[PDB]
Amino acid sequence: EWNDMDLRGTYNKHKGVLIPPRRRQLCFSRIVRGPANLRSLNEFKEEILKGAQSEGKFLGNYYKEHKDKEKALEAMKNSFYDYEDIIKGTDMLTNIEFKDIKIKLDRLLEKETNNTKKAEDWWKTNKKSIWNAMLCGYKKSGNKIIDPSWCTIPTTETPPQFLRWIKEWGTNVCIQKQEHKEYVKSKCSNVTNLGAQASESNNCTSEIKKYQEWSRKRSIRWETISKRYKKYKRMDILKDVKEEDNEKEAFKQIKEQVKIPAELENDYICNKYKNIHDVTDNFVKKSWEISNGVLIPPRRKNLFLYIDPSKICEYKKDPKLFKDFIYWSAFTEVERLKKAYGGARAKVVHAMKYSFTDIGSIIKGDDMMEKNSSDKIGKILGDTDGQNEKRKKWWDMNKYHIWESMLCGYREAEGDTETNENCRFPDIESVPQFLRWFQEWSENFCDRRQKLYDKLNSECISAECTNGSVDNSKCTHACVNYKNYILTKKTEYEIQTNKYDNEFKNKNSNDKDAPDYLKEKCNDNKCECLNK
Numbered sequence: 234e235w236n237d238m239d240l241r242g243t244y245n246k247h248k249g250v251l252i253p254p255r256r257r258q259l260c261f262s263r264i265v266r267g268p269a270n271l272r273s274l275n276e277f278k279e280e281i282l283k284g285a286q287s288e289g290k291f292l293g294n295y296y297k298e299h300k301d302k303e304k305a306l307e308a309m310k311n312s313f314y315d316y317e318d319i320i321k322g323t324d325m326l327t328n329i330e331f332k333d334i335k336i337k338l339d340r341l342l343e344k345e346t347n348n349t350k351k352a353e354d355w356w357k358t359n360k361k362s363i364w365n366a367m368l369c370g371y372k373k374s375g376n377k378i379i380d381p382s383w384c385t386i387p388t389t390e391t392p393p394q395f396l397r398w399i400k401e402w403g404t405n406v407c408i409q410k411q412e413h414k415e416y417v418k419s420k421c422s423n424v425t426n427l428g429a430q431a432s433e434s435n436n437c438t439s440e441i442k443k444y445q446e447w448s449r450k451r452s453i454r455w456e457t458i459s460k461r462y463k464k465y466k467r468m469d470i471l472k473d474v475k476e477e478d479n480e481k482e483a484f485k486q487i488k489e490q491v492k493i494p495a496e497l498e499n500d501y502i503c504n505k506y507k508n509i510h511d512v513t514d515n516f517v518k519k520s521w522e523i524s525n526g527v528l529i530p531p532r533r534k535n536l537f538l539y540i541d542p543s544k545i546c547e548y549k550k551d552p553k554l555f556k557d558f559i560y561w562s563a564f565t566e567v568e569r570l571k572k573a574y575g576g577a578r579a580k581v582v583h584a585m586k587y588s589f590t591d592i593g594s595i596i597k598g599d600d601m602m603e604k605n606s607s608d609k610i611g612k613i614l615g616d617t618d619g620q621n622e623k624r625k626k627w628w629d630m631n632k633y634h635i636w637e638s639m640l641c642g643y644r645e646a647e648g649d650t651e652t653n654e655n656c657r658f659p660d661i662e663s664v665p666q667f668l669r670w671f672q673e674w675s676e677n678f679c680d681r682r683q684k685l686y687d688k689l690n691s692e693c694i695s696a697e698c699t700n701g702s703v704d705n706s707k708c709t710h711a712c713v714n715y716k717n718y719i720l721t722k723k724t725e726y727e728i729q730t731n732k733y734d735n736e737f738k739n740k741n742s743n744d745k746d747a748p749d750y751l752k753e754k755c756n757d758n759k760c761e762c763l764n765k
Contacts (some may be wrong), residue, residue: 235251235254236252237251240252247463249452249453249457249458250641252456253405259291260290263287272279275333278359287364288312288313292309295308295312310389310404311401314400314401318397319332320332361388366408370384372384389482395461402458405625414488415445415644416440417440417441417491425493444487447486448484452484477633479633479637479657485580500641506641506642509560510564513569516531517574526724528728528729536592536597537569538606551651568640570585571639571642577655582654584677586662587676588744592668594666596624596628597621598610598617598618598619599618633658636658639686661756671750673727674728675751678764681718683762685714688711693705
């Protein structure tokens with residue numbers, strides 16, 4: 234069982250270090266001490282080799298318990314990586330006098346004040362010695378890396394000091410968390426299939442509650458583990474005076490798979506942007522021109538997608554680079570989309586939200602306004618009209634990565650601005666595909682609608698007109714905006730009339746009526762300007 238309280242009491246130094254659940258049971262063959270006064274130099278070298286020899290015998294039988302290859306390799310690397318840190322470190326650990334007494338005996342026996350450094354060579358006199366001993370035996374006893382007429386793994390280079398402990402700590406938490414995720418997926422996997430009642434779900438609900446309490450205990454001490462970790466990175470000691478998930482909430486909270494039966498009754502993430510290091514046309518303030526009666530989408534007319542036919546063969550030869558190139562295409566947006574819009578928070582945030590939904594629509598493979606892009610996509614993948622779950626989830630993870638990338642850039646721009654915008658993605662962007670059609674149509678109505686009444690004050694209604702022809706023209710040329718808005722309303726009526734022709738009323742005409750669809754779609758009085 235988890236001996237956290239017992240470990241804290243026995244350790245007595247108040248550092249929240251908890252061993253994994255598997256690191257409490259071992260073959261009870263080690264004795265506190267063997268011979269009392271039988272002391273000889275080379276013999277106790279063999280004794281620590283015997284310890285290494287003992288380290289060759291627990292994991293030999295323990296390997297058969299976890300027959301999984303990935304789990305076996307993880308456990309074996311952890312076993313042969315943890316123990317060498319204490320012996321190789323030659324520093325203070327959670328041990329009373331075991332290394333201290335032997336080092337005392339070493340400096341007392343060999344020579345005075347001139348053998349400690351050579352004692353370090355003792356480790357390199359025996360760290361490689363243990364590896365060569367196992368090479369003599371056959372490979373049947375222990376599976377290794379498959380080689381021609383040979384089965385061994387390459388020697389692992391010793392990590393630098395202060396880096397080994399975090400690697401041992403890091404691999405420990407990952408294995409435990411993946412084991413418990415495997416347990417939570419194994420238990421209560423299917424609930425909606427004849428399990429809507431609370432009878433059979435009780436055990437898995439209790440398991441989820443226990444796991445949540447686990448995460449609550451694990452969240453608190455990690456910062457304390459980070460607390461001593463931050464204070465132990467002292468550099469330049471000689472001084473005058475001593476001195477995939479989104480955030481941590483994913484770790485504390487449970488995975489969304491339990492959300493179905495859950496119905497009510499320091500900056501390393503941004504550094505990847507550095508790792509992805511290594512065009513403007515002014516299409517937002519342009520003058521709208523009528524051409525063939527079809528409005529040109531400003532968001533889609535200047536799509537940043539240029540496919541080079543010279544590297545089509547590399548799409549079949551080395552796709553793996555091109556995938557990163559696809560990520561580099563996202564990098565184009567993080568060097569193009571952010572700078573183009575402006576500085577106003579709300580308009581810019583809705584701007585790139587609409588840009589991302591438009592590019593996702595373009596890469597949904599359902600709209601066929603472009604021929605070359607559709608043909609190239611069919612050649613590369615041969616997708617279907619709308620049956621692309623993998624492509625949809627791919628766009629979803631690109632959207633999540635681009636949103637996480639935008640957060641660091643906007644946050645880094647200012648130093649004291651308040652984060653009014655939500656760090657995570659609101660559910661409003663998760664609306665269905667005809668809902669995002671409705672969003673695109675609705676976003677162009679009440680903005681300039683509200684702007685229209687603002688222009689009334691700026692007009693010259695106070696000044697009067699008399700004597701036939703007007704005396705001023707600057708206050709009368711602005712009246713063409715009403716006719717332009719009427720033309721926009723007419724083209725929106727034409728497009729919506731065309732919208733009915735898409736389905737043709739074969740089946741599933743509409744989820745609900747449009748008069749209530751427009752008003753109930755908004756949340757907490759958000760449709761005030763929409764057809765008011």
